[PDB]
Amino acid sequence: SQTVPELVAWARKNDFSISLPVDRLSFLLAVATLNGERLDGEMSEGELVDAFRHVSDAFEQTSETIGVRANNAINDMVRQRLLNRFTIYRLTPLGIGITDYYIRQREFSTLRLSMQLSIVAGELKRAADAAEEGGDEFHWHRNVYAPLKYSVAEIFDSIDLTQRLMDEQQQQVKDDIAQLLNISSCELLLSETSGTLRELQDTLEAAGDKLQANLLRIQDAHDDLHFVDRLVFDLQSKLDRIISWGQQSIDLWIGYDRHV
Amino acid sequence: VPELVAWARKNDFSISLPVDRLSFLLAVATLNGERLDGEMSEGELVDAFRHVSDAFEQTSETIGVRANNAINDMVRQRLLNRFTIYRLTPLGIGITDYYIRQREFSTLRLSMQLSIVAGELKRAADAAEEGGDEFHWHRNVYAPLKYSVAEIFDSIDLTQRLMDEQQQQVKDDIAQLLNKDWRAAISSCELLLSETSGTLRELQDTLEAAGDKLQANLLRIQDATMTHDDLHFVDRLVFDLQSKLDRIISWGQQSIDLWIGYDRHV
């Protein structure tokens, strides 16, 4: 409540912003097409300039002013933190996240989820075994704290991520059905989406119980171990949030389904 | 591939996030990360907007309207999904984490990512070699490569780039320190130099320790697809993962060279 104003202060003080008109985005998009398809060397300035030429030509822009304009774009991109200049160029994580969103083929399948669900199961059951038969701070730090902090936490974020890829799909089907209403195909799109949302939560819920117990086991196994307890607390509440959104999305799809 | 440009053009894709809109987006983001029971309602997001309006000395009588506009413009731009209630999209999340989430450059983090990718790669190579049927290929070699190994390579690349900006920042901070007076700030510059030298070396030593064996097993999977032929799609995925891992080790060395370069330069 008083944290989120300090955020604004900070943001305001730092003057953080992104400006990507359609031609700037595309330029950034095309650059990512080389930073993903580039043999092994990193991207030179002449390479960035060449990509600018293409989008420049594509947008009908005056060829005479490229060099000037391309240098301006590249400088904007550095300054807006989407690109790094080394003394050659590399997209920053900001650049990478934004571009990935567009040029990536992030397809959602229940498989992705099941895959991610098992690996964490394994790292979790292991950490739990580790913590049941204790040791020095070195055995705690390495076989129970770290596993939890660096690999459990990270694949809960990956599943969070997979869920959102499913949110993206829902919306697109909505948009797709909204096109077909502007019939029988709409019953198909409605159908198979429910199936997926239903397959999702079954395999989520199924593993969910198992993951939960092993968190519970680890909690049960001391002072000077609170920072392990904290970690476990919000891994739980991260997991529960996922599952809850899991159920949540199925219920409101029924809202959307019978609505047509 | 300038039809991507045609595609971006014909779809009017863009990002328009001025300081006041981004602050709001960051605001929303910190609701999202620090969340008990429930998702994000339109109510929470409006109270979020309030504080950013307050802090930007914006007109208080209009707040309700301008919030609906701001929230609306987030959805349009695809930062946010509205459900009939609000969720940050993949795009929203990436942009947001860039500014907000902690940067952790732990060697041990890396070592465990490498370790679990080693096993996933070993099992997929085992699975391919004795390759059963269509379901077997989809679930046991491809599914781990893309949904698990690809995801970890992304995240290693991602913290290499995080490190890229620690590098440049330091290089900037060192440049300013030795301006006012070179002979005094050397002791501190030597600090900043050697700590980054240390981080970069350690991360690379870990990567190079895993790379040859991750490569071997990626090769095995490629091997087991050429005695078949309906597996172009596993073949292509192996080829990308091979390319990516090589970019990462290679860029790893480039950074060191560049840093040793900068060290010499002072």
Curated annotation (Swiss-Prot), chain B:
One of its GO terms (cellular component) is cytoplasm. Residues 193-221 are annotated as: Leucine-zipper. GO terms for molecular function: calcium ion binding. Keywords: Calcium, Cell cycle, Cell division, Chromosome partition, Cytoplasm, DNA condensation. It is found in: Cytoplasm, Nucleoid. One of its GO terms (biological process) is chromosome condensation. Interacts, and probably forms a ternary complex, with MukE and MukB via its C-terminal region. The complex formation is stimulated by calcium or magnesium. It is required for an interaction between MukE and MukB. Belongs to the MukF family. Involved in chromosome condensation, segregation and cell cycle progression. May participate in facilitating chromosome segregation by condensation DNA from both sides of a centrally located replisome during cell division. Not required for mini-F plasmid partitioning. Probably acts via its interaction with MukB and MukE. Overexpression results in anucleate cells. It has a calcium binding activity. This is Chromosome partition protein MukF. It comes from Escherichia coli (strain K12). The gene is mukF. The chain holds residues 8 to 281 of 440 of the full protein.
